[PDB]
Structures are given as structure tokens and as C-alpha cells.
Amino acid sequence: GSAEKRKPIRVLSLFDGIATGLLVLKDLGIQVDRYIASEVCEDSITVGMVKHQGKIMYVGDVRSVTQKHIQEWGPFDLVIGGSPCNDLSIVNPARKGLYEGTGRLFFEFYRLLHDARPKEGDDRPFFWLFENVVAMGVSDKRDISRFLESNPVMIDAKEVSAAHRARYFWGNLPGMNRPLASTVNDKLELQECLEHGRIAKFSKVRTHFPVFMNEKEDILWCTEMERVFGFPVHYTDVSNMSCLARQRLLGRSWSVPVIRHLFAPLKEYFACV
Amino acid sequence: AEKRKPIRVLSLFDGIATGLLVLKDLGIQVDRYIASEVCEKIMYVGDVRSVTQKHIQEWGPFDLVIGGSPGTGRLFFEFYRLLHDARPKEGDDRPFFWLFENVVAMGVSDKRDISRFLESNPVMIRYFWGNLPGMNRPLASSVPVIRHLFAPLKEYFACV
């Protein structure tokens, strides 16, 4: 209810991956004051380091960030994160649950978020987002929704892309449950993502052989995967990594249109280009 | 800083009323004792999954938070949630103490993670974390135990 000039957003991204959050914030025209990312895989760090010109301040393992570090590096306006899910997926029979293995990394989030929340009486806007899979144990989902004191929003990227990708999003972002918008940039069909001379067997990919090329079924190429998930073409064409490693990076990533849908209302809260 | 008042305790301990027995053993007045467990004005509230931040706010304020057992992650993380929910707000210098017990037979990953989250290195006896004057420890390289550890509490709260 008071007057001030809109200021650029200050972001803390845990488990940043290939810097989907910064890409989405840039695409929305939101000015990014600061982008401190916690990422441990060197390939993802190289992707984000190259494709954003060292704007990202990398701090490494999320377990090496202390509350004093949050206070000194802060304040932060947005705290986003997507913890590893190999120990949360019911597909994995050797899963260790939410509290063991790599699932307990979630609590790191729950830690730093509470360290980054404005102190009581501070009416400044503050937003956070935590993404994970839907195919987790019901007990794990209940526990996550208990710790975060929020019920998740189920969003499937098949509605704004050519990928079957349903995910749970906890957070306090404005209107996360609002209906998604299929715009003209959205490539809703797998055929729209293929390179020249390839045909798509299915409308939306579920990652058999999804494409036919000159009477010979193939798998999806890497640039086609970038198009499917909404990333710019050759966005992951850095650092001489194997195609399997690039596929690994792209599979753990966020669907760009989904994150754009989630971040769009932030334009009425921060400076915009 | 008013005159000494009776202590208010929140227990997620594996053995219910262990903390209450230790407190009565030291002769400390108890104004409230809320106990809970993990499963899979002195009250037992059952499953910790049923305890919310609003419940902690209503039953509170709390002065002591105890937890542990004589996977280790679930117990500690429930205890950590309750500790965060019961901790005084920044700028409230009122006394607030906590203790977490576990067995020494735990993965080094678990011990280091617990020490990191609690910002405290453990006391070896079993392993014990706490902020009571006495269990401040540098970097590492039966209820009588809790009695001796809780000894400094009678210097901060009213005794009968």
C-alpha cells in the first residue's frame, strides 16, 4: 500500500541444474539483481556458466551453505529448488525414502528457506517454489506437504509442451493453480520438435523409439529434446559432454513453459525490462 | 527477566515421559509437558504427523525441546521440525534449550548431517546434541545421563 520504484528480483536457486529458473526469469523480462545457485554436477554448472555469461554466482553443495551465508548473501526475494528424486521415485525399488539417501536433501531446502524467510513483521514480498515428482510414496508426499505447510499443485507439461511430465509444485507463488495458457510459442506436438526429415510416432513423448527417419526408427535427438522441454536449441551444447550426459541433464530439468507459467505473476512485483 | 517460572517442555522422545521423570528427578517445576512420537496440562498428542505449527503455537510457549532414542533420519527430522516451530522468534532472548539423543552406532553421514543441522558437535557418553551449558563441544576427530546433562536447567527455571 506504499510507493516505491520496482526493484530487480534476488534469487536463490538450490539444485539449479541447467539454470532453468534464470532462463525463465530472463524470458519473462524480469530484471535479475542477483542469482546465487547451489549445484554440484559440473556439467550443469558449465551449462549455466556458459549460457548466462557468469551472471550466476555458484556456491556448490547445498550442504555447505550456512544460515550466516544466507544472511550475508541475502536478502532474497525468490527461493526455488528441485531436489534429486532417485530416492523418492516408486519406480526405483532400491529407493531409500524421503529421510535417507538423496531424498533427505529436501530438508536442506526446508532449512535454507527458513533461513531466508523475512523476519516476523517484515511485510516485504517473498516467494518460494519446490518441485518434485508425482510418482513418489504417498507417505513421502504427505511428509513434504507437512514440512512445507502447503499442499502441492500438480502440473503436467503435456499441456504446454510435447512431453508427458507431471510434477508436484509446492510454493506460495501467486496463482499457481490457475489454468495454464497454451500460447503460440508452445510446441504442443512432438512432430513440431523434430529436425528436418523425421516423423513422430506419438503426439507426446513419455520419456520406445519415438521417431521414424527414412524407414528406420530412431530415438529422440538432443536438440529435439531441448525443443520438447522448451529449452532453446543447442542450450546444452557445451563442454564436450557425451550425448548420454546431455540427455541426463535434460531429463532432470524443469519444463520451461511450466516454470514460465509459475513465474509469470512475479512481473507485478519486481522491475521488468 | 522475571522471577523463575516453571518449565514448559515439548517431547518427541522415543520413551514418553522420560524427560518428565528426569525433570522431577532434578526437582524442576513443570507447567506444561506435551509428548509425541514418530510411529510409522500434561498431554500425549500421539503421532507427530498430526502436530502442526499452529498446534505448537497454541500449546506453547515452550522452554525445552527434547527428542531422540536410546533409519535415524526420520526421528531427527521430525525433531528438527518441532525445534524450528518451537524456537523463539528473533529478538526474543527468553531461555530456550533442546536435547537430542541417539545411538553412536550411526552412519558418519548421519552424524555429520545432524551436527550440521543442529550447529553443534555431539557429546559422546550414545551421542547427545544440545545447547545446555556444558554440552558445548569442539570439532570431533537409563536416565542418569540426561539428569547430569539437564543439571544446568535448575539455574534457569523454578524449582520446587
Place this chain on the structure above:
Amino acid sequence: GSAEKRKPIRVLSLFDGIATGLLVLKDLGIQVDRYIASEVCEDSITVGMVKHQGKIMYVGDVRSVTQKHIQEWGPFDLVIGGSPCNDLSIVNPARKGLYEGTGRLFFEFYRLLHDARPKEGDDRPFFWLFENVVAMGVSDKRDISRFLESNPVMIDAKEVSAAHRARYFWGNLPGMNRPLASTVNDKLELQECLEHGRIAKFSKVRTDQHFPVFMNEKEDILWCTEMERVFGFPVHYTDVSNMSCLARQRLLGRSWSVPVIRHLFAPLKEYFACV
């Protein structure tokens, strides 16, 4: 000496690789009627198929192309080729020479070229280019110059790019020996080709115990996009078909330096239609 509207060029590319010739012809603004390429490695075929939208008519092994094929597919205005060199380089001790192994592939060129030149009395313009390595046996170079009835022109990509790449070019292209022009598009230094956050040890790269680039106080080899920039190709030009970065490096190593081929093909604008 007579009048006619200049027509688009008809090209036969043997050992085409990643379609460097078509890329250079397009960049110069020359109109391409048709582009028939003989290539056997499927990675190169996928590169050329994707990055030029299926405009290349692929015919496969050069040894499967007959004189009747050259006649029926023709006429052709430009016959270009760069045969494999692993049996011609002196760096290979197991080299089999020009006449055995993969070196004899050269003669396929010499074959099809003679099947493609206009019959005597046909005053129509007709050009051809054959590229190979400098580090080859002197006897092999003399034999190639004998069979092609032309002395080669030595061109090093270092003069017009950031790569050490000296090659022999036999051909009747107009003014092949003319001085090369260093334009503004040319990235003469390796630093100009590196991605963000990397520093170049040297000024120009060579074809061990040297990691050409420093990155954040660590030694690294050249990235694929940086190799593309070094060789003159567009960025992500070889980012197709899920091939290993080693295979991408192999494709880029065998290729022509784009600015060198542009220098060689420039005078063709005065002979064919230009968009």
C-alpha cells in the same frame, strides 16, 4: 562472348563430408541448381541432410557412381572433392601410398572428373577442385599433379582463421593463387573462438601434452563449438544425430576450412546466378 542470363550452378561433390562446399556456395550468394554428393560416413550424411534441408541428393559410395550416372545426372558445372588421406599422410607409418589402401580413392575423382568434363568443342565453363594434405609423400604429390595435369596451390587456413591447416588444392578455379583476404568476419585468433569464461593458451591451434585453453585455473581441450568457430563453420553446425563428441571432432577434423573454400569459390560469382 555471347549473351545469356546467368544460370544456377550444378555441383558434384565427392567425399563431401559435412557439405562444406554447399555451405560456402550458399554463403557467397551463388544459386545452386542441384547438389549431388558422394559420401559414405552416415554421420556426415546426417549433418548435410539436416543443415541443408534435404537439398543434397546423396548417392553413396563414390565407387558406385558410373559414367552413365554422370551423363544422366549431368551436366555439372563444378566438380569438387577431398579424398581420404590416412594412407597419404607421412605421419602414418602404416600408410599404403597413393595407389593402395584408401589413397587409390583419389583415382575415383580422376575417373569421374574425366566423365564430367564437357566433350571437346563445348566452350561452356567447367571447374573442378581437389583438396588433400601437404604432409604427404613427395612421390605421391608428384603423381597427383601428374594425373591432374596441374600443379597444386598451397593454402594454410592460419592466414584466414585461427587454425594451422596447410593443404594442397589442385584445380582450374579462377585465381586460386591470388592473395587471400582477411575480412572482418574472420576470427584470426583462438581467443575469438572460445566460449565465455575461457582463455586461449596460443594464438592458433594445431592438429601432445598441450591443452589449448585455460578455464578457471584448469587446463582443457577445445570444445566442439569452439572447433566449429576455429574452422569457420556456424556454431552448432555439427550438433545433430546424437553422435559422440569424439565423432563430432572426427567430422570437424576431416573438413575444409570454411574461409579457405570461400576464398577459392569467390570468383564463381561472375560465372553463375547469384541471389
Place this chain on the structure above:
Amino acid sequence: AEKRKPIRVLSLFDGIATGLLVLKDLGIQVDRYIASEVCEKIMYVGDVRSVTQKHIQEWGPFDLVIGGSPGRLFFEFYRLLHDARPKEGDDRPFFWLFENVVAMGVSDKRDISRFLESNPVMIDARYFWGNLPGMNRPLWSVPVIRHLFAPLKEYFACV
């Protein structure tokens, strides 16, 4: 043609005199016989690597081209063949023979058959490629080359 005229021959054969011996053994008149080897008026011209296309033009026209040995020399023979072939539209008679040993790589046999557009004649054991009538095939050496050259008596003058 005006009449039967004496033959003109270009020999890259290993053994400079073989072609002339076989030609005189069949009684065929010879206006020109020029022999060359691989190294590395009847006349010897030395290394084939010294023979140019202009030399073939000046010494020519040629009616017969022979090469081989009872290999890198096949490509030299093929160069001389291309240089000696009649221009398009010249239906004058022109013949060639290439001999090699049957002990060759199957790759070499296939490559020679491709380049010469002809399948070879097996003679147990040597391979003979040629366009003489009777050398059409589907998929010392003096007497056999004599019997193979036999059809030359019907295209050139005999003494």
C-alpha cells in the same frame, strides 16, 4: 576407313618387346610402337612418369594400348588409356589389353573390373582384361596374348 592400315601401339607392358613380338607373330604391320615402363619408328620412352598427355597426342594417334605384367601400374595404364582414347564421335578402331596375375586381392580385381568396365578372362593362371572381340566376359605369355590378339588381323593391315 580407306583401307586396312598398319597398327599403332602404346605399350606400358612389363617387357618392352612382348607386344611387338606378338604382333609380328601374327603378321600385323606396325607403323608405330612406343614402349614405357613403371620404374620407380619404334621407340623406348623410359619412365611412364615422364610421359604426358601432350606426348601421347604428338606420338599418336594410337590403335592398341597394352599393359600389365605376368598393383600401382594399373593406374598408370589407365591414365595412358584415357590419354590415348579416341575423342567422342571418332568411331575408329581402338583396342586395349591389361594382363595381371590371378594372385591378386579380390578388392584389386573388383576395382580393375570397375575401372575398365570389363570382367576378366581367366587363363590357367592369369587375368586378362580387354575389349578385343572374344574378350567379352560376364560376371611365357606370348602364345596366349597371340591367341587373344588374333582378332586384330581383321582390323589392321597384315604383311
